[PDB]
RNA sequence: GCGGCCCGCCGUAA
RNA sequence: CGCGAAGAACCUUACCUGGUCUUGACAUCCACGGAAGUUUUCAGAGAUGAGAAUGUGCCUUCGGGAACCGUGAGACAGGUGCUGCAUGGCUGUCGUCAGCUCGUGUUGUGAAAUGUUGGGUUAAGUCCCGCAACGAGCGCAACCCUUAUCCUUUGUUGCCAGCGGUCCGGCCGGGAACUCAAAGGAGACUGCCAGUGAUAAACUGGAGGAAGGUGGGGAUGACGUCAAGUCAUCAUGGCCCUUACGACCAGGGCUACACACGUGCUACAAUGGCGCAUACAAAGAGAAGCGACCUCGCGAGAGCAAGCGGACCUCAUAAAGUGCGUCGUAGUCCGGAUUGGAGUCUGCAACUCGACUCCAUGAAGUCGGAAUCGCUAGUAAUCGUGGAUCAGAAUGCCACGGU
């Protein structure tokens, strides 16, 4: 245990919050367990499309959310029967009334979030894991990004000692609090246990 | 100790009976599980048998050991020493 | 150190005197960091020392740290296999520092009431040229002068 | 017409107005011998007009909050030695050399993770 | 930890609050001054008498996210290594690192 | 009429900033005199957590929450004034309190 | 230029 | 080895004794009866059993959900059970040490080498010069927080130089100067001078300046090593229990005691103990809670009760220091452990097993063998204050100032 979290380091310099709102010491609690309901249900929900991003804020009577994906037509459906759907539903979990909103992922290649569980899901399907991350590496580098990284960890089919296995090109610097590094995990679960997996993505150096 | 504005505590359901074999004759010892009651006046000469953890021991109450509890007597961990 | 450590501290004189050498020995008689039971004992055992002695305020102090005053001593110098214990020579401000520490190291261990008694005492004992603080002297001299042999480093 | 200066020590601050007058050390309306403890405080207060203008024509209307006695002390003296500054612009030629115009900047320092002060380390006796 | 504890926590707290009112004037009268002998015997026979797992000191606040009964925290409700990890993702808004 | 006191809170600075440069120009618009936004003292509170599941006491990290206080104090209502608080009041993270 | 100071059970990552 | 545990009387609690249950204390299912209820009697250590009135109410679309209970069967639930040598995630350590590699090109049959070596420098694989090598990557440094100096903006609940009276309290009228408050800027870069140096890179001094040579202190931990630690926070692959290794209740234990180690607190005194009077901080907390003023108490506390969601009120008197008097080297008007009696308070409940108050008693101890560790400046040593966990409860932990 040796690397600082490269998203929590950099909250206050050149990355924002997911949760934006103010309260006193009687209901941070509540809030707390509120968001991470809604959260986690929407999770659940919405697995099947590609969901990057949940960002909670809350007005003075109401909360607000906004999603983040790459296929936006499969949540907002035919017509918005299914947004209000999940508007009914969460407007259940938490007492205020709710809006929702639909953000449009342009690049899914990055947002290593996609990524990370793209490569999980291909796991699943029992394929070798050096093809996916030579072929994750190369959409991403042929996209245009200044650098790459990723690495998987556990039981990779072999009894002996997990391994551990990672490729990098172009530039990565971690010491270096101006940088946009945008960082995500994920986990399989296979027949012989799980499989860890991190993303590192250099969108570019920002002033 | 308490306050001595509060009294001392019974546990009453050991009072329900104290009050009645105290009479009507009934000298049979009698089982308890309430280390944490005081002993009163009304209980003198009385036999009670009180529970250690394991099995209930009984004692024969007299007349200055008014004041103290239950629990007091009846010992719970077993000691004779390193040998 | 490995590295060298350039500059020194400064400290103000006396404030009744205006003399670095109170300043420093007031600083070694300190202990727990408080000062000024210090210098209050300090002031006392000076003007008990200056009364039975006939002198200013200073000429006894510097009489009897001159009576108690390193000139040479040994150090642990060693060259092919075993040690050599050699003499050497001492610049002035280690030879002050010694003295002083010696003068309060001998006023602490004895048993007259008050340490202002004590260390009025064990001074107009130095200014007489006797006292366990001359011993330390003498017998470092002693030593140091039985090694005259190895002194050729 | 009066001057001013400000001075700062580890956590004192001091207010200085100066004027013409002859002798007046009147501190938080107190005399400076009866608020100060007889200790080096008083020498460390008046030795920066001792070597200039030796306290004849000046007046020491002062306040002070915050701290001890000697960073009280300390905040005093570097207020008065700044005030003067604008009275005399050829007195830096000395102050400086004195070593009265520099701000000392010592402070106590945290209490880290594991310490038991800021560097004092808990005993290691393991084998 | 396992069901049955969280079960045990939620009755424990349903009990408490349902009792609530009539303890009040029960402890009042107990420790009232201008009291009587008869009635504050009785209100002390009487309190006893309510069920046990109803005192609000019967009660060991855990984790929401698990229930672990050490490592708390009023201000959020969340174990340390919760409150850790949340905190590193974004979820807690205004926290940060400090240094000073 | 009075004072009238709004204070606001926020755990950011630059959104407090937005929000009383905004608050002072409606009422600046709607006529009447109002004085400077106060700069009030912040505070600031700290944590400590340990960061290993099982062991090893030294590994801590340290967290800290901000709160940034501003006070207004519009003096003399017109009119209008207060209608147009009660339109005029939108933000998102920032606590605003009016006091008669 | 030379004072002294011995040992470490059996197998065992792919 | 003051480690998980930021807090053990019941609960927590996993452990022991005994009393109890079997689609279950917690979910999804299926079929009937059923607002959910609220008061209350008895047997019980209690779980739990018996009971009696209270109750049957919505949309009715006419049967369902709301409403939860009570039944019977079956899929199932439930395991702080074993394996950290099957794993993910998260930490320690070498070590804040300066190293660890790649692409292309050359050398060797090959494992490999070269670059990364050499001269001079630096805290540094930090930089110049040379050289079959020419360029890159992760590291170093910088970008982040705080502290030290000034300038603008704003001026209350914060401030008081000038003005006026004022009970002489910033108390009031006033002021916007100063402290301060929190936003925005300036500032240090070997910048300049002299010398040394391969006419480099740098290194010695000097000036100026609040600060001078990465100003001080943090946060940031490369490739890897130790089959290091954790299946009991959590999640998981394998096994293995299912009238029991699952579940409920009351008492007991985790606090035992011939002994042995680690980490701390208080002392053995005159640089001190006791009595009286006085003087200068910083940083935090507050609604099932901070709790003032008065009145009872020797005391811990009790009654009445203002203010405060807080630059306004409460916590909340800083202590070492400084002046007087005494004790006179004495196991002592040093030291306070143990024990008796009498109380307060929190809590259903202080026996095993809490914290404080009063009176009495007053132990070992006179500086510690062989051995052994912490610290380079506002640092060691010493003196006080706050916070979290929390009904109650720190000599521990995490923070703040004085000398």
Known sequence: ?207 | ?83 | ?153 | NQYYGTGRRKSSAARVFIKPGNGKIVINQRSLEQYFGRETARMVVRQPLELVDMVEKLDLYITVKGGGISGQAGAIRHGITRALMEYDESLRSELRKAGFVTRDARQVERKKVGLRKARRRPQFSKR | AKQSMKAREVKRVALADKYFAKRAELKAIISDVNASDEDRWNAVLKLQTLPRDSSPSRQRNRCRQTGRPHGFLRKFGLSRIKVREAAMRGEIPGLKKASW | ?100
């Open chain 6, 1 to 100: 009429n009075q004072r009238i006191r709004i204070r606001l809170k926020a755990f950011d600075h630059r959104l407090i900033d937005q929000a009383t440069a905004e608050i002072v120009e409606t009422a600046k618009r709607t006529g009447a005199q109002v004085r400077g936004p106060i700069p009030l003292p912040t505070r600031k509170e700290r944590f400590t957590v340990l960061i290993s599941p099982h062991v090893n006491k030294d590994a801590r990290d340290q967290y800290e929450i901000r709160t940034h206080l501003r006070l207004v104090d519009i003096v003399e209502p017109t009119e209008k004034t207060v209608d147009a608080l009660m339109r005029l009041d939108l933000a998102a993270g920032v606590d605003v309190q009016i006091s008669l």
């Open chain 1, 1 to 207: 245990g040796q690397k600082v979290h490269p998203n929590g380091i950099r909250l206050g310099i050149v990355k924002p919050w997911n949760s934006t709102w103010f309260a006193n010491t009687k209901e941070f609690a509540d809030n707390l367990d509120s968001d991470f309901k809604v959260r986690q249900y929407l999770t659940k929900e919405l697995a099947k499309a590609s969901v990057s991003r949940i960002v909670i804020e809350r007005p003075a009577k109401s909360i607000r959310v906004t999603i983040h994906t790459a296929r936006p037509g499969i949540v907002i459906g035919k017509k918005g029967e299914d947004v209000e759907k999940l508007r009914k539903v969460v407007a259940d979990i938490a007492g205020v009334p709710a809006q929702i909103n639909i953000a449009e992922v342009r690049k899914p290649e990055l947002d290593a979030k996609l990524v990370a569980d793209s490569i999980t899901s291909q796991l699943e399907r029992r394929v070798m894991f050096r093809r996916a991350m030579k072929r994750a590496v190369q959409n991403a580098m042929r996209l245009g990004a200044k650098g790459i990284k990723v690495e998987v960890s556990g039981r990779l089919g072999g009894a002996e000692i997990a391994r551990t296995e990672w490729y990098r090109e172009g530039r990565v610097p971690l010491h270096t609090l101006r940088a946009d590094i945008d960082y995500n995990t994920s986990e399989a679960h296979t027949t012989y246990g799980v499989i860890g997996v991190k993303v590192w993505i250099f969108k570019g150096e920002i002033l």
């Open chain 3, 1 to 153: 150190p490995r590295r060298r450590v350039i500059g020194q501290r400064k400290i103000l004189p006396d404030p009744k005197f205006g003399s670095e050498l109170l300043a420093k020995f007031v600083n070694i008689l300190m202990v727990d960091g408080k000062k000024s039971t210090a210098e209050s004992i300090v002031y006392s055992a000076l003007e008990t020392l200056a009364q039975r002695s006939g002198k200013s305020e200073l000429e006894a102090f510097e009489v009897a740290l001159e009576n108690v005053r390193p000139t040479v001593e040994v150090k642990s110098r060693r060259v092919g296999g075993s040690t050599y214990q050699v003499p050497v020579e001492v610049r002035p401000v280690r030879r002050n520092a010694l003295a002083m520490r010696w003068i309060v190291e001998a006023a602490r261990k004895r048993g007259d009431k008050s340490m202002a008694l004590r260390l009025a005492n064990e001074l107009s004992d130095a200014a007489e040229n006797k006292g366990t603080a001359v011993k330390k002297r003498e017998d470092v001299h002693r030593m140091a002068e039985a090694n005259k042999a190895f002194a050729h480093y």
């Open chain 2, 1 to 83: 100790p308490r306050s001595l504005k509060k009294g001392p505590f019974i546990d009453l359901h050991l009072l329900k009976k104290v009050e009645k074999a105290v009479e009507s004759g009934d000298k049979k010892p009698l089982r308890t599980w309430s280390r944490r009651s005081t002993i009163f006046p009304n209980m003198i000469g009385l036999t009670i048998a009180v529970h250690n953890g394991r099995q209930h021991v009984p004692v024969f109450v007299t007349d200055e050991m008014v004041g103290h509890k239950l629990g007091e007597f009846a010992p719970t961990r077993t000691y004779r020493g390193h040998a």
